[PDB]
């Protein structure tokens, strides 16, 4: 057994992290007080769920998680929320004033003064691990902390844990739920400095989660709670292999091995189905073929883009619930004969399939309906480069006039870092084009 440490940075990372550990507890039968009756080994054990939960002498199961935010109002929710008893104070770290949506302020000004503190609290968790795998880092692109402090944390983690894997869950900026105009700047600045430090990153576009919540859940104006409960379902589907007995994606190294043949192209597209409203009178339960087919519908992707006009480098199918391999292969056969699935010639045209028999858990009183089977597809498509192009274009529009740049230069960042970051994205876009076109 090897442990995973989850790091939550900024408001997005903290509130998403709050929703994940809520779901993790429901899945593993852990109560808000940390007690796990089903756990017959009191105060220890090297079970699969122990990769995410430590244990005390009193039987408390404590998340292997750190929460970091430069302002205290969001982490204060955790300290007085339902799961306040899960974490001890050392795990929750807050400053007094935030990065003000300014990458330079989170990375340089405030990051320099709090980086050593965060690394110290992470070292404490690491010392409780007999074989640490690596880190899962949740954060947004647009926030000054999510962007600026994360990139600094990723740089130091590569120094302090050279042989450890690092995976990201990143929130891509969407104007429908964003009030910061400079988020394209922060997104590109943090991708540039985190690229060589992240082994695999799962981007979630808020625009996609927003529309899924309006379309499938009939929420006219989704909130962060609605968005985060849906995101934690996808996150749960992705991390289930590390927390339950299995043979696929059993450690963090396997995510790169299976999804990322080229290091810089490490942004798999996530697609999830089914998302059914809980207020529905009663939904006809979808089959393996239908939920699998839904994995190739743009409306269910975590990033709106057209995989029909890209090329696949890898494809994983993560099923949860009543699913047997026979029905999976049948559905895949039918989808090849109908869908436009073009793989790169230097990669086999295949699918790695993982099945966990425990159906998805839904938060009681939540928005999602209990379904008998679900699937999350992780596919490395060149089509996700559309999200880079969209973001890079917005960057170019503002930077051509040096709009807002003085805020970053005022925090000590040099203007050259803007163009250095943009040129690195231009090279990233060219890599996708060389592989897919």
């Amino acid at each position: 057994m090897r442990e995973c440490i989850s790091i939550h940075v900024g408001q997005a990372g903290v509130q998403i992290g709050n929703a994940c550990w809520e779901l993790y507890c429901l899945e593993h039968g852990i109560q808000p007080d940390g007690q796990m009756p089903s756990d017959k080994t009191i105060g220890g054990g090297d079970d699969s769920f122990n990769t995410f939960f430590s244990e005390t002498g009193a039987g408390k199961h404590v998340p292997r998680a750190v929460f970091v935010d430069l302002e205290p109002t969001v982490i204060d929710e955790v300290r007085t929320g339902t799961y306040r008893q899960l974490f001890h104070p050392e795990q929750l770290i807050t400053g007094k004033e935030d990065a003000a949506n300014n990458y330079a302020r989170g990375h340089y000004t405030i990051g320099k003064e709090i980086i050593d503190l965060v690394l110290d609290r992470i070292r404490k968790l690491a010392d409780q691990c007999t074989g640490l795998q690596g880190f899962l880092v949740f954060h947004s692109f647009g926030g000054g902390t999510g962007s600026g402090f994360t990139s600094l944390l990723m740089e130091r983690l590569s120094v302090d844990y050279g042989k450890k894997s690092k995976l990201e869950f990143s929130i891509y900026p969407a104007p429908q739920v964003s009030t910061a105009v400079v988020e394209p700047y922060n997104s590109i600045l943090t991708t540039h400095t985190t690229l060589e430090h992240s082994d695999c990153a799962f981007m979630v576009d808020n625009e996609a989660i927003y529309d899924i919540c309006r379309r499938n859940l009939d929420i006219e104006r989704p909130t962060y709670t609605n968005l985060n409960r849906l995101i934690s379902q996808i996150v749960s589907s992705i991390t289930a292999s590390l927390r339950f007995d299995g043979a696929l994606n059993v450690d963090l190294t396997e995510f790169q091995t299976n999804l990322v043949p080229y290091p810089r192209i490490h942004f798999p597209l996530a697609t999830y189905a089914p998302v059914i409203s809980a207020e529905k009178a009663y939904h006809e339960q979808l089959s393996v073929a239908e939920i699998t087919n839904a994995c190739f519908e743009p409306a269910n992707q975590m990033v709106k883009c057209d995989p029909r006009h890209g090329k696949y480098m890898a494809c994983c199918l993560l099923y949860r619930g009543d699913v047997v391999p026979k029905d999976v292969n049948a559905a895949i056969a039918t989808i090849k004969t109908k869908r436009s699935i073009q793989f790169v010639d230097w990669c086999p045209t295949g699918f790695k399939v993982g099945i966990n028999y425990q159906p998805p858990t839904v938060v009681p009183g939540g928005d999602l309906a209990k379904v008998q089977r679900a699937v999350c597809m992780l596919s490395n498509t060149t089509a996700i480069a559309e999200a880079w192009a969209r973001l890079d274009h917005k960057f170019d529009l503002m930077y051509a006039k040096r709009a807002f740049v003085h805020w970053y230069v005022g925090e000590g960042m040099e203007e050259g870092e803007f163009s250095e970051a943009r040129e690195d994205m231009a090279a990233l876009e060219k890599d996708y084009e060389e592989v897919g076109v």
């Binding site: 007094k96 949506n101 964003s178 009030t179 910061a180 104006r221 529009l397 503002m398 006039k401 709009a403």
Partner: protein, 421 residues
């Protein structure tokens, strides 16, 4: 605990500041004696942003009243909520400033500024994490204009990394006290260009026209004008006084509204301006209409760099997004296309007293150059004949300082013009 320290200087600054604390004190459930008597936890959630908490559960505004003559501040102390202010936070002289920028900035004001900074320092030393400062003042007089901008200068020296924000009342010949107002305003504007992060330009001409034409007030008084400023000051600060993530503090607001450091002068607007229900479409149409603007500049004469809108009350947040997206998509020729998504909307549930719902508008428009042009022309009409300069040279000033303020404001105009094309 992100505290803001409030300063009000001069006659105009203290009369508008008084009304401001009267309005938001009501919205937060604070009575004239500082005792809380509201009924919603949303009122106290961010109460510490503008109020200190004294013994006995008393809420005392974090406000500093400054003047070079006692008259106006005596009225405030005798006004409705006069008793709510800290007695030690009244700092005033006896000489007055005679509507003379030089007297407030170099002579009379210099004698008094150190005692004001001592009270500023006392309020900051008791702040858990000070956001910054907001100053209410006029630009056409002597104390608020001359001493106010001296205060900003000395506050920026001692707190260089805090946000400096002002509500600045611009003079107009239609609502004028003395002919030297263009001189005092042109000298102040240069100070503001350098030492403030955000300045809400409140034009007394716009306030007058709104009272005469829209509100149908035959003979508007200074009191009538200040009612519009109160409502506006309460609208623009709602994001700071209640929960939210959209421009929730002064620095985040500045980051979203100011793409270039010197172009930080905002046109504010309010809607509505009597028992009939006001729909979201009506709130939106009016809020973007020039007649509802407080700067007396036609937005259709320039382009919006950034826009921040705040909707207050129980309404359809979906219907708000639809109407906001309808004004942008129906007039995108007035929004610079090189700042994507430069229109941000915030919603607050607590409406203002006596209104089911309202909307407040904050625009960083290049049309604001029309305001600086009016001042510049009035300035030059007198300065070319050196008229009324003796009031200033008698206080140690030289003509060169006027020539430089003039050039500085004409540069500011030219800077707005280039981003408008």
């Amino acid at each position: 605990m992100r505290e803001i320290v409030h300063i009000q200087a001069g006659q105009c600054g203290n009369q508008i500041g008084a009304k401001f604390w009267e309005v938001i004190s009501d919205e937060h459930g604070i009575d004239p004696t500082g005792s809380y008597h509201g009924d919603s936890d949303l009122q106290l959630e961010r109460i510490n942003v503008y109020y200190n908490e004294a013994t006995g559960n008393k809420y005392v505004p974090r406000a500093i009243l400054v003047d070079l003559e006692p008259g106006t501040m005596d009225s405030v102390r005798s006004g409705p909520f006069g008793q709510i202010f800290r007695p030690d936070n009244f700092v005033f002289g006896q000489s007055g400033a005679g509507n003379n920028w030089a007297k407030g900035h170099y002579t009379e004001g210099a004698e008094l500024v150190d005692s004001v900074l001592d009270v500023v320092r006392k309020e900051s030393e008791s702040c858990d994490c000070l956001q910054g400062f907001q100053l209410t003042h006029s630009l056409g007089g002597g104390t608020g204009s001359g001493m106010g901008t001296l205060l900003i200068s000395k506050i920026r020296e001692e707190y260089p990394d805090r946000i400096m924000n002002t509500f600045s009342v611009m003079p107009s010949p239609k609502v004028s006290d003395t002919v030297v107002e263009p001189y005092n305003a042109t000298l102040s504007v240069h100070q503001l260009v350098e030492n403030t992060d955000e300045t809400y330009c409140i034009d007394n001409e716009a306030l007058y026209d709104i009272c005469f034409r829209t509100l149908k007030l035959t003979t508007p008084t200074y009191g009538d004008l200040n009612h519009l400023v109160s409502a506006t000051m309460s609208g623009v600060t709602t994001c700071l006084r209640f929960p939210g993530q959209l421009n929730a503090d002064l620095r985040k607001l500045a980051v979203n509204m100011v793409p270039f450091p010197r172009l930080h002068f905002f046109m504010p607007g309010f809607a509505p301006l009597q028992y009939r229900a006001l729909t979201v479409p009506e709130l939106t149409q009016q809020m973007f209409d020039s007649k509802n603007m407080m700067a007396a500049c036609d937005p259709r004469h320039g382009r919006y760099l950034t826009v921040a809108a705040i909707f207050r009350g129980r309404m359809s947040m979906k219907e708000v997004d639809e109407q906001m997206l309808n004004v942008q998509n129906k007039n995108s020729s007035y929004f610079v296309e090189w700042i994507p998504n430069n229109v941000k909307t915030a919603v607050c549930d607590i409406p203002p007293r006596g209104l089911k719902m309202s909307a407040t508008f904050i625009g960083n428009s290049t049309a604001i150059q029309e305001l600086f042009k009016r001042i510049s022309e009035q300035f030059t009409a007198m300065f070319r004949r050196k008229a009324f300069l003796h009031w200033y040279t008698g206080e140690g000033m030289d003509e060169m300082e006027f020539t430089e303020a003039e050039s500085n404001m004409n540069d500011l105009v030219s800077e707005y013009q280039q981003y408008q094309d």
